[PDB]
Design a protein around this nucleic acid. Structure first.
Ligand SMILES: Nc1nc2c(ncn2[C@@H]2O[C@H](COP(=O)(O)OP(=O)(O)NP(=O)(O)O)[C@@H](O)[C@H]2O)c(=O)[nH]1
Ligand SMILES: [Mg+2]
Ligand SMILES: [Mg+2]
Ligand SMILES: [Mg+2]
Ligand SMILES: [Mg+2]
Ligand SMILES: [Mg+2]
Ligand SMILES: [Mg+2]
Ligand SMILES: [Mg+2]
Ligand SMILES: [Mg+2]
Ligand SMILES: [Mg+2]
Ligand SMILES: [Mg+2]
Ligand SMILES: [Mg+2]
Ligand SMILES: [Mg+2]
Ligand SMILES: [Mg+2]
Ligand SMILES: [Mg+2]
Ligand SMILES: [Mg+2]
Ligand SMILES: [Mg+2]
Ligand SMILES: [Mg+2]
Ligand SMILES: [Mg+2]
Ligand SMILES: [Mg+2]
Ligand SMILES: [Mg+2]
Ligand SMILES: [Mg+2]
Ligand SMILES: [Zn+2]
Lengths: 14, 88, 129, 104
RNA sequence: UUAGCUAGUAGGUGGGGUAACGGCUCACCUAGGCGACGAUCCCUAGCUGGUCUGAGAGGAUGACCAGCCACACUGGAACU
RNA sequence: GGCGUAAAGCGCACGCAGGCGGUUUGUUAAGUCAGAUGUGAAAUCCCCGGGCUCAACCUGGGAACUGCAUCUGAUACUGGCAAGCUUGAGUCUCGUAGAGGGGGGUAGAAUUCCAGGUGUAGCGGUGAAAUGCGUAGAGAUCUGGAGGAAUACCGGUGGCGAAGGCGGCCCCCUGGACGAAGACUGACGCUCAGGUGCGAAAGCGUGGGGAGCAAACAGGAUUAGAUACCCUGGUAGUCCACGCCGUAAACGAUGUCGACUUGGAGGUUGUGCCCUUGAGGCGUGGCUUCCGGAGCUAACGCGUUAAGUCGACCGCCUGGGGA
């Protein structure tokens, strides 16, 4: 949910 | 922490007057004498893990207050680290 | 904590507008005056006063229609976790041009309607819908 | 420790060296008596056939009824008492299996 | 379910070297270099201008056209 | 896009790196924005055309290529520096409450064992019985002693602790929480991947300890069989020291912090004033439960302690089964 979380690891596409 | 004679004297040791009690250097000395007071307690009472939380609170509190004086004025920092025996 | 004080300002406006409050108070600053004075000049609110100099306290007078919310909703856009910036031709509109978008530039705080004659861009503050 | 295990499955067919077939059986601890009336329980025992129609009444529970000639044959010793105590244990088992209901 | 990797390695002197700067090469001197902003190891893949899809943001890929790099049975080397 | 119950909030806490940050002024122009240059090959796509009888297709110029580099600008916001300020977060004093932890003593019931006395045919146990105990006198009662573990009543959606949890009394050592009056430092803060410690009980290692309860097991009923249930016994373990193990339906099935948004019934804990005119009247903080409006929600329900409206940061989930 947090944009700063996605800096470390993006959303994992299946 | 301590009694009235131990608290008020160390404030008069490191403070400019009796009113200089809220400053950071006094707060280091309040934690320095308290950890030195609890050296022989936790050696005998290693199974007191609940009072160790109060001990680790004051070690973490003293580390944060040393980081404020070091980043602003290092002249007062180099005085207090050897005057109380820090940096190990 | 109070790390986004503009978002704290938008919280205190949106609550008392919906909960039929007559007037609200909040801690003042320079930037909060530069937003509420623009909203005073855009018909959304009524009046603002300053109180206290060692503790600056801002006050806002609410505004209603028949007991109905004038400011229906307001949306914080940029934030300390994610900064938002646009150019002079990428300025977004609110409700296709009905609502205003508070954008602070080097020529002070103005709207995107007022940024057409100014020709500048910068930080989006809030979507006054 | 004091029990037996049913390892072999239901039934496997083989042949005798002379003639006929064999059928193995499972290790079974079950008793299905949902079939018929307790009149057929009286017919389920060989030597009790020749002693029917000798009691007092035309209908008889043979446990709590006075003058049961089947009970007189057990008391005489021509029928062992192990079979008679197990006989009404079958009838009292129908007082406990029947309880909920079951029908084909 | 890859956390330590690396001794010509990192830097300096001098000699040598190519068309040009340079550990490009050699002796000596220093013990550093790289790395949780992914070093290193393993697997996969030519890349890009684009094509296709999608309201857009994105998504999948790199045939024909064009640009570049690599390769010419396998491996190594030099001449002209 | 979600994480109270549909899959999902690590059991909890500390804290580095990282992200983020109250308020006032100056400065730098870093980020950003404005303008301009150079560049972003052609072809493809888009705009208007032209051409092949038409279309496909070819093609003129323009736009597009939201890119990158440099210069000149503006200073509101973000960043850096400088000086600050006090409401955030801290420090002192006076106090009050509490099963907070550790260590060492100590009390009295009850259980069982043992000693003695009086005393006699059953005690014991269950739906009903039996195993078991007892004429060497059980059981019951009384006196006296030993050992072990737990703390009735108080005691209650009561209190405390980060959580698991924590309960006789007393001493010693020691931790945080909260309130009143001011004084004082001046953002010293929030949050947390690795790392670090605590962490129900079972079980594991070494050495003690042994009442009661009690896996496995002994024995008797039950039964089709009893392995379980029921009953009579009984070892490991439960106890302590010293470690290790680190998982739970470790649950409020809600990560932490802060800002606001109508209210009641109470509880607990203080404090300020008041014909003290009663343990009361009036206020006002801390903690906590049940109702309930707006609002939210898939429904249940939440509803100033949010699951209402928002910000700061982190963890985690992506059909069921495999797992
Ligand atoms: N001493 C002895 N053992 C015997 C005798 N008969 C059989 N056994 C043993 O008894 C055991 C049981 O035999 P088994 O035939 O397997 O029994 P089962 O009834 O077939 N079992 P299941 O119910 O699985 O089919 C075996 O170990 C067998 O050797 C005998 O006469 N004497
Ligand atoms: Mg205290
Ligand atoms: Mg050289
Ligand atoms: Mg070709
Ligand atoms: Mg090619
Ligand atoms: Mg969904
Ligand atoms: Mg679920
Ligand atoms: Mg939890
Ligand atoms: Mg082109
Ligand atoms: Mg062209
Ligand atoms: Mg074209
Ligand atoms: Mg035509
Ligand atoms: Mg006792
Ligand atoms: Mg001051
Ligand atoms: Mg063991
Ligand atoms: Mg049992
Ligand atoms: Mg043990
Ligand atoms: Mg688990
Ligand atoms: Mg519940
Ligand atoms: Mg309602
Ligand atoms: Mg409610
Ligand atoms: Mg799966
Ligand atoms: Zn008869």
């Amino acid at each position: 949910a947090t944009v700063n979380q996605l800096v470390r690891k993006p959303r994992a596409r299946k | 922490s301590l009694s009235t004679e131990a608290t008020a004297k160390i404030v008069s040791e490191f403070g400019r007057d009796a009113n200089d009690t809220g400053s950071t250097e006094v707060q280091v000395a309040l934690l320095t004498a308290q950890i030195n007071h609890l050296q022989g307690h936790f050696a005998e009472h290693k199974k007191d893990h609940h009072s160790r939380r109060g001990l680790l609170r004051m070690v973490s509190q003293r580390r944060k207050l040393l980081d404020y004086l070091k980043r602003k004025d290092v002249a007062r920092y180099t005085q207090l680290i050897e005057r109380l025996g820090l940096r190990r | 904590s109070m790390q986004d004080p503009i978002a704290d300002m938008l919280t205190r406006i949106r609550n008392g507008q919906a909960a039929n409050k007559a007037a609200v108070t909040m801690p003042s600053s320079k930037l909060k005056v530069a937003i509420a004075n623009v909203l005073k000049e855009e018909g959304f609110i009524e009046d603002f006063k300053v109180e206290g100099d060692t503790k600056p306290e801002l006050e806002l007078t609410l505004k209603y229609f028949q007991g109905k919310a004038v400011v229906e909703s307001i949306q914080r856009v940029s934030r300390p976790g994610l900064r938002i910036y646009k150019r002079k031709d990428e300025l977004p509109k609110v409700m296709a041009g009905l609502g205003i978008a508070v954008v602070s530039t080097s020529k002070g705080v103005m709207t995107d309607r007022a940024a057409r004659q100014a020709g500048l861009g910068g930080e989006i503050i809030c979507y006054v819908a | 420790s004091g029990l037996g295990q049913h390892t072999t499955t239901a039934a496997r067919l083989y042949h005798f060296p002379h003639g006929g077939d064999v059928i193995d059986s499972p290790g079974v601890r079950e008793f299905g008596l949902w079939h018929l009336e307790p009149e057929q329980i009286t017919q389920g025992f060989v030597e009790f056939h020749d002693y029917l129609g000798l009691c007092k009444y035309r209908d008889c529970k043979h446990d709590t009824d006075p003058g049961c000639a089947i009970r007189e044959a057990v008391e005489e010793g021509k029928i062992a008492e192990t079979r008679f105590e197990n006989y009404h244990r079958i009838l009292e088992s129908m007082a406990q299996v029947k309880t909920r209901k079951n029908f084909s």
